[PDB]
Amino acid sequence: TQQPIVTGTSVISMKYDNGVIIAADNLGSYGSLLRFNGVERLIPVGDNTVVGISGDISDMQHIERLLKDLVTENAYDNPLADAEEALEPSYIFEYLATVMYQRRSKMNPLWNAIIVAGVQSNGDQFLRYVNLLGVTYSSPTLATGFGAHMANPLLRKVVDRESDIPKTTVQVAEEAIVNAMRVLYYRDARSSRNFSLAIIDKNTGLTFKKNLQVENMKWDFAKDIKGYGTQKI
Amino acid sequence: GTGYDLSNSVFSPDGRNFQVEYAVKAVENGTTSIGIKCNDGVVFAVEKLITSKLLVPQKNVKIQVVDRHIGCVYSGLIPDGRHLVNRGREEAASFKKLYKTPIPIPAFADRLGQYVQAHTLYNSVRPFGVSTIFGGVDKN
């Protein structure tokens, strides 16, 4: 048992026809103080898989070192570790779900919320999420904490069922994700203007971008609201 | 007295350990393996002997990799070198876990040498019969 100190934030993810799109901000929050802005939330393991997690910053660094050690172990005595055999998202997902379960059962869990997005070698997209309590489920749209009831109503309209996946393009998914991130920045105190967006695709490979902010924000309607109530001026 | 080569830690009258010498003589009965220290890095090489053609080509390998920048090429008792490189990989993993810096080559050398000599101090352990040409590139 422990109390998280430097809390994370929401991480948004949703799949499309040619892959999955995941996005997250860059901000570390200590209570009500926004300490770190250079904190990274997406750690691309391999080329066809990106994992986005939230929680205690020490915990994300611990999980990151776990992922690096896992990659080092996979690289051992494997001549096909580069092209044929690769760390597909399912393997790493159930690995960190298992380690999360062992941490929980020992009664010293790690405050975390892990989302893994990847494309199988056969072309099938993978998207699943696991928390510190170890609950696992695969949905076309996932989010974290505050965003769980926040981003889902936005991302679920474009893609709602499995039949919607082939009908959604990468550009539509990207604009839906950026609109969602705009909404979270509008309505979540733990996010910042800066964010990070990652695109995975079975054809163009991994696409990861840094230094992404939120533009196209409307605020000219806030100068026509005067007072908290009966006050007019 | 006779039997100065039966055990391991026993010293010969001239002061030379005998099981280690026999391990050295066992090393030479192995596939040749060279390594060149070029200016920027290192270049290993092995001569894995093709037995009866039933063996699959280009599949059995002997250049084992440690972490990313340390390579291990071994000759002699191949399994013994397998175990040695396994322990070396564990040491490199521990170092990167608790220092988060890739293990420098001399440090890996110190770790492997200390492990190797740990097996030629006792009477209840056979000395390693593998010679390695391990090397790689580091910050320096």
From Swiss-Prot, chain A:
Nucleus in keyword set: yes
Keyword Signal recorded: no
InterPro entries in alphabetical order: Ntn_hydrolases_N, Proteasome_beta4, Proteasome_bsu_CS, Proteasome_sua/b, Proteasome_suB-type
Predominant location category: cytoplasm
Cellular localisation: Cytoplasm; Nucleus
Other remarks in the entry: Present with 16900 molecules/cell in log phase SD medium.
Function according to Swiss-Prot or TrEMBL: Non-catalytic component of the proteasome which degrades poly-ubiquitinated proteins in the cytoplasm and in the nucleus. It is essential for the regulated turnover of proteins and for the removal of misfolded proteins. The proteasome is a multicatalytic proteinase complex that is characterized by its ability to cleave peptides with Arg, Phe, Tyr, Leu, and Glu adjacent to the leaving group at neutral or slightly basic pH. It has an ATP-dependent proteolytic activity. PRE3 and PRE4 are necessary for the peptidyl-glutamyl-peptide-hydrolyzing activity.
Subunit composition and interactions: The 26S proteasome consists of a 20S proteasome core and two 19S regulatory subunits. The 20S proteasome core is composed of 28 subunits that are arranged in four stacked rings, resulting in a barrel-shaped structure. The two end rings are each formed by seven alpha subunits, and the two central rings are each formed by seven beta subunits. The catalytic chamber with the active sites is on the inside of the barrel. Interacts with CIC1.
Similarity comment text for this entry: Belongs to the peptidase T1B family.
Descriptive protein name: Proteasome subunit beta type-7
Species in which this protein is naturally found: Saccharomyces cerevisiae (strain ATCC 204508 / S288c) (Baker's yeast)
Swiss-Prot record, chain B:
Subcellular location field: Cytoplasm; Nucleus
Post-translational modification: The alpha and beta forms are probably products of the same gene with different post-translational modifications.
Secretion signal span: none
Quaternary structure and interacting proteins, as annotated: The 26S proteasome consists of a 20S proteasome core and two 19S regulatory subunits. The 20S proteasome core is composed of 28 subunits that are arranged in four stacked rings, resulting in a barrel-shaped structure. The two end rings are each formed by seven alpha subunits, and the two central rings are each formed by seven beta subunits. The catalytic chamber with the active sites is on the inside of the barrel.
Family per record: Belongs to the peptidase T1A family.
Known role: The proteasome degrades poly-ubiquitinated proteins in the cytoplasm and in the nucleus. It is essential for the regulated turnover of proteins and for the removal of misfolded proteins. The proteasome is a multicatalytic proteinase complex that is characterized by its ability to cleave peptides with Arg, Phe, Tyr, Leu, and Glu adjacent to the leaving group at neutral or slightly basic pH. It has an ATP-dependent proteolytic activity.
Remaining remarks: Present with 12000 molecules/cell in log phase SD medium.
Protein name, as recorded: Probable proteasome subunit alpha type-7
Organism: Saccharomyces cerevisiae (strain ATCC 204508 / S288c) (Baker's yeast)
Organism ancestry: Eukaryota, Fungi, Dikarya, Ascomycota, Saccharomycotina
Gene: PRE10
